[PDB]
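User: Reviewer 2 asked us to show a designed sequence for the structure in our supplementary figure. I'm pasting the structure tokens here. Could you produce the per-position amino acids so we can include them in the response letter?
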């Protein structure tokens, strides 16, 4: 009578940030990529709504209405005309406030788990609409694979990533608040005329060719300059992973996690070991993508 759903962390292979909109979000164009660093969420019927967390953020992560999974349970229950009487257990590998949208993964997982738990038969298009109400990254956590995100990031068009791509992720000592990083890119742009990414075409071509070596120099994230402004030590992490043999390093999302694309699974084993020995980040992970979006794995 429990349903467990796995939802992936993401890395933005490409992230162009536009103007601040009326709604307080920035317009953006991104290429989301789902990776095997995931959260597992177990949902059970219960007498009241509750959340518990182990893994990343075990000491740390709020379990009240601050948690996006709370709001996901309330929203889904309301959609289907029921009370959100479910216990939610989150076993987290996605770093907290790390740029990989772990709270969004958890919220996506709750939608899918409650759908199955209750056999509510709510369709993908409707789960997508609910996800978009919860946050800009929640729809991608439902969708998974690799996708072109537009609008605020909630509008998705699937793209082909025609291989397995091999990653090392370097978790930082702390976290960054996503709104501070967007404020900082705005500040940097008020001040100067920093470089903007080219169009996504070439990067999308490299993905469709399945070619990590071609993809690597095309990766780019316009928030990286903001994350590095706030946390300049991330330059040491980027430099270390690259020197260890990564094809490329980029900050993931709003940071401060650093992502390193490698040529093969064996290459990532080597890069992760060298990076762990370098003394420049908190802890290191190996992963691959693309992986599926939020999916039931038990129950
Ligand atoms: N497209 C986006 C997405 C997020 N943001 C910033 O990040 C914050 C968190 O966004 P989400 O709640 O959608 O995750 C927003 O309140 C906003 O400050 C943005 O400015 N533009």
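Assistant: Here is a per-position design you can include in the supplement:
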């Amino acid at each position: 009578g429990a349903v467990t759903v796995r939802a992936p962390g993401k890395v933005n292979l490409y992230l162009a940030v536009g103007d601040l909109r009326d709604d307080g979000y920035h317009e953006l164009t991104t290429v989301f990529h789902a990776v095997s660093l995931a959260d597992d969420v177990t949902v059970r019927d219960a007498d009241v709504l509750s959340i518990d967390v182990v893994g990343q953020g075990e000491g740390t992560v709020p379990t009240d209405e601050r948690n996006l999974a709370w709001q996901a349970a309330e929203l889904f229950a309301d959609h289907v005309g029921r009370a959100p009487d479910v216990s939610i257990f989150i076993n987290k590998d996605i770093p907290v406030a790390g740029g990989m949208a772990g709270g969004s993964a958890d919220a996506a997982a709750v939608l899918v788990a409650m759908n199955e738990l209750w056999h509510a038969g709510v369709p993908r298009r409707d789960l997508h609409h609910l996800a978009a109400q919860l946050g800009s990254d929640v729809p991608f956590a439902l969708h998974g694979g690799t996708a072109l995100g537009t609008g605020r990031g909630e509008q998705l068009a699937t793209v082909l990533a025609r291989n397995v791509f091999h990653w090392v992720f370097a978790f930082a000592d702390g976290g960054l608040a996503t709104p501070q990083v967007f404020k900082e890119i705005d500040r940097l742009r008020e001040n100067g005329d920093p470089p903007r990414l080219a169009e996504a075409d070439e990067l999308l071509g490299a993905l469709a060719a399945g070619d990590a070596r071609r993809l690597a120099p095309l990766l780019g994230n316009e928030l990286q300059a903001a994350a590095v402004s706030l946390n300049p030590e991330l330059r040491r992490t980027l430099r270390a992973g690259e020197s260890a043999g990564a094809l490329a390093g980029i900050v993931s999302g709003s940071g401060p996690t650093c992502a390193f694309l490698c040529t093969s699974a064996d290459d990532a084993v080597q890069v992760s070991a060298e990076l762990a020995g370098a003394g420049v980040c908190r802890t290191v992970r190996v992963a691959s993508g693309p992986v599926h979006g939020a999916q039931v794995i038990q129950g």
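For the response letter, you might also mention the following. Residues 25-26, 28, 135-137, 152-153, 178-179, 182 surround cytidine-5'-monophosphate (CB under 6 Å). The two ends are 7 Å apart (CA to CA).
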